[PDB]
Amino acid sequence: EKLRFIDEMTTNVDAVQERVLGEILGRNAGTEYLTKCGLDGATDRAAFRAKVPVVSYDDLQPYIQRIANGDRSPILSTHPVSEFLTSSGTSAGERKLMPTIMDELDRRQLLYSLLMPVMNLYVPGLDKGKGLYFLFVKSETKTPGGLTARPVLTSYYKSDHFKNRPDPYHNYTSPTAAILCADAFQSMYAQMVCGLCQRNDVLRLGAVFASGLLRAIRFLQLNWEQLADDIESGELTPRVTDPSVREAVAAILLPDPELAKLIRAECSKGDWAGIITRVWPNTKYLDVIVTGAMAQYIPTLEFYSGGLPMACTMYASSECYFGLNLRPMCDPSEVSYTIMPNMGYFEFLPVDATQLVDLARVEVGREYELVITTYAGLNRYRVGDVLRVTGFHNAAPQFRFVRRKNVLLSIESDKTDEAELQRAVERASALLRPHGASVVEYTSQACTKRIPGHYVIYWELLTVVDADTLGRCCLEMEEALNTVYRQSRVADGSIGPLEIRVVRPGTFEELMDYAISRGASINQYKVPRCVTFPPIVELLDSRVVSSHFSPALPHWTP
Numbered sequence: 001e002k003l004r005f006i007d008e009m010t011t012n013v014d015a016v017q018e019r020v021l022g023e024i025l026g027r028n029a030g031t032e033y034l035t036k037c038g039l040d041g042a043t044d045r046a047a048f049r050a051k052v053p054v055v056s057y058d059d060l061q062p063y064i065q066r067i068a069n070g071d072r073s074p075i076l077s078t079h080p081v082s083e084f085l086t087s088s089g090t091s092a093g094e095r096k097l098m099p100t101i102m103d104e105l106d107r108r109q110l111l112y113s114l115l116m117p118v119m120n121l122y123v124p125g126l127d128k129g130k131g132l133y134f135l136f137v138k139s140e141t142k143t144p145g146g147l148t149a150r151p152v153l154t155s156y157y158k159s160d161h162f163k164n165r166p167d168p169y170h171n172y173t174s175p176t177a178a179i180l181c182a183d184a185f186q187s188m189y190a191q192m193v194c195g196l197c198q199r200n201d202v203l204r205l206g207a208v209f210a211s212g213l214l215r216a217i218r219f220l221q222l223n224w225e226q227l228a229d230d231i232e233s234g235e236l237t238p239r240v241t242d243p244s245v246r247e248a249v250a251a252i253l254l255p256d257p258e259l260a261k262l263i264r265a266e267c268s269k270g271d272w273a274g275i276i277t278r279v280w281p282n283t284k285y286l287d288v289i290v291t292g293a294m295a296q297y298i299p300t301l302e303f304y305s306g307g308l309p310m311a312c313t314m315y316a317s318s319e320c321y322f323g324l325n326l327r328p329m330c331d332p333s334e335v336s337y338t339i340m341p342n343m344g345y346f347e348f349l350p351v352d353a354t355q356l357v358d359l360a361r362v363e364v365g366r367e368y369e370l371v372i373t374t375y376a377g378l379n380r381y382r383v384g385d386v387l388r389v390t391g392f393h394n395a396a397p398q399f400r401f402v403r404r405k406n407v408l409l410s411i412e413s414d415k416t417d418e419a420e421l422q423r424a425v426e427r428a429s430a431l432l433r434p435h436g437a438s439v440v441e442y443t444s445q446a447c448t449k450r451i452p453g454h455y456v457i458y459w460e461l462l463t464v465v466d467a468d469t470l471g472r473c474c475l476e477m478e479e480a481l482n483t484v485y486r487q488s489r490v491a492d493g494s495i496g497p498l499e500i501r502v503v504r505p506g507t508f509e510e511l512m513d514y515a516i517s518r519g520a521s522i523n524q525y526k527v528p529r530c531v532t533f534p535p536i537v538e539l540l541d542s543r544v545v546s547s548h549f550s551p552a553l554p555h556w557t558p
């Protein structure tokens with residue numbers, strides 16, 4: 001029983017953790033990295049705790065670049081590297097490369113196998129229908145040494161764990177051919193058409209991130225005309241060039257006019273509230289992450305779903321799959337993730353290795369940074385995630401996701417940190433300085449009033465700059481932002497043009513006075529992003545003199 005496995009693992013947290021670390025060290029304690037730490041082959045917890053330092057990405061990057069450039073000696077593991085999983089987190093504007101090994105796919109597959117067993121406890125009958133999940137592959141590259149680098153889900157979807165899988169609780173409408181198609185449009189359109197045809201078997205709707213599902217809905221808003229047509233005519237549109245997709249959908253696309261009729265009846269109305277249960281009326285819930293930065297999207301999802309529950313099922317990363325939500329139907333505000341003690345060796349830094357707290361021993365109410373040791377040879381690596389213990393499941397702590405440290409803005413997988421944002425502001429002022437203008441202060445917000453959302457930067461200038469020049473400032477900020485952002489702009493369409501709102505002189509002084517109604521004066525520092533979803537965003541907006549948008553896409557190529 002998957003459920004009994006969860007109960008055993010969480011009952012025996014600290015014993016499992018010891019055994020896992022023994023397995024990892026049995027595998028790796030003889031690698032270059034651990035030998036350099038002086039472990040000298042020890043596989044026991046006391047030796048490890050004593051000798052292995054806590055590290056960040058930049059401490060490991062020298063080892064990673066050696067592997068990327070073709071070093072195939074056992075640097076990090078006696079299981080050598082199979083590919084690089086590209087985190088959406090960056091350093092110097094480039095994606096961090098998380099080495100993985102072939103063995104880890106099986107542990108990822110184990111975590112996935114736990115999800116529907118838990119869900120089935122709260123939502124009956126899912127086996128009697130399909131899931132409409134919009135899933136997408138993104139671009140791959142190769143390192144100078146020949147290894148592939150690509151996102152974990154892209155790796156997942158192109159793996160046979162996924163392609164040739166044995167299961168009624170995983171009956172999906174999307175043909176893997178459409179999932180694997182490069183082009184966002186063809187992939188989206190083809191998956192929409194298959195979701196609509198099968199509209200009535202659809203018991204749940206989803207995508208990895210809430211924003212992905214929102215972009216699927218916007219896609220419908222823009223293409224239901226041709227969609228209703230191909231449904232009626234039963235003929236695949238020739239916008240779809242990709243021959244492998246055409247063959248997958250045309251394999252289930254049946255001519256159906258009673259179907260096409262309704263699609264027009266619901267999408268012709270200008271009102272799209274509850275559109276999801278109107279097109280897919282047996283939908284029981286939405287399977288999308290809406291914790292952390294995706295929380296922004298909850299109101300928008302509710303409007304389109306008509307109030308359907310939103311399941312946040314899993315907590316995972318490019319470097320390590322962590323665990324799962326044992327209460328997937330709770331309220332989004334109530335989500336906590338139970339880290340699974342078999343997935344790696346997990347330690348916690350209260351927000352140096354002597355302060356590390358073991359998984360079993362974290363304290364309810366406290367916030368910690370996640371520090372992980374993995375089979376792939378990450379050793380006391382800091383993920384950057386801040387977590388708050390909300391309680392315990394048997395001996396296993398449960399965590400509310402707080403944030404990834406230093407991340408200011410995300411629309412999707414982009415994770416723009418304060419350093420990149422500040423440098424972006426500095427690069428755009430080359431357009432301002434000839435006017436005699438400079439940016440006295442700025443802040444930002446992720447704006448999701450439309451799909452896709454976009455970055456809004458507030459500028460208080462000191463000197464007038466014309467509107468075309470300020471729009472070019474938007475573009476320049478985008479050129480300076482990281483590869484994930486620009487890729488999302490040019491390739492995915494998941495982020496719309498960046499917006500600069502110029503605020504009147506004295507605006508940030510006011511922003512100070514409003515927070516001071518609370519905050520400590522000689523403790524205040526201007527927030528570089530604002531989320532207090534009404535009061536502070538409303539105050540800034542109320543001081544805006546003009547608004548400007550990037551008139552063109554930034555540069556990006558894989």
Ligand SMILES: Nc1ncnc2c1ncn2[C@@H]1O[C@H](COP(=O)(O)O)[C@@H](O)[C@H]1O
Nearest residue numbers: 087088289291292314315316317318404
């Ligand atoms: N429910 C969630 N599941 C996975 N990642 C999350 C969640 N909420 C926030 N995140 C962030 O997403 C990161 C994974 O980034 P990546 O390695 O690009 O997949 C995590 O380390 C978290 O900071």
